[PDB]
Amino acid sequence: GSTEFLPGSLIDRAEFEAENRRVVAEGGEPAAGRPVLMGITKASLATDS
């Protein structure tokens, strides 16, 4: 919706919650998420650096 998140991506929980909370004001379209499980190789290849 208004969360500029590509559907089907993987997003860190803290950032997702922060963005949804910032968008709840002056808006009405929070994004929806579902918990996911990742391995120790694809979880360490998805780092920010």
Side-chain angles (χ1 to χ4, degrees):
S2 313
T3 57
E4 73 266 357
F5 290 146
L6 282 62
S9 301
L10 297 185
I11 298 305
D12 197 337
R13 209 191 295 111
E15 170 190 2
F16 164 84
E17 278 186 347
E19 202 281 350
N20 266 14
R21 177 164 52 91
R22 179 186 58 83
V23 173
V24 69
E26 51 84 36
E29 205 290 321
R34 192 193 189 102
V36 73
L37 192 72
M38 304 173 68
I40 61 182
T41 27
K42 73 186 310 307
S44 48
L45 284 166
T47 42
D48 204 62
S49 68

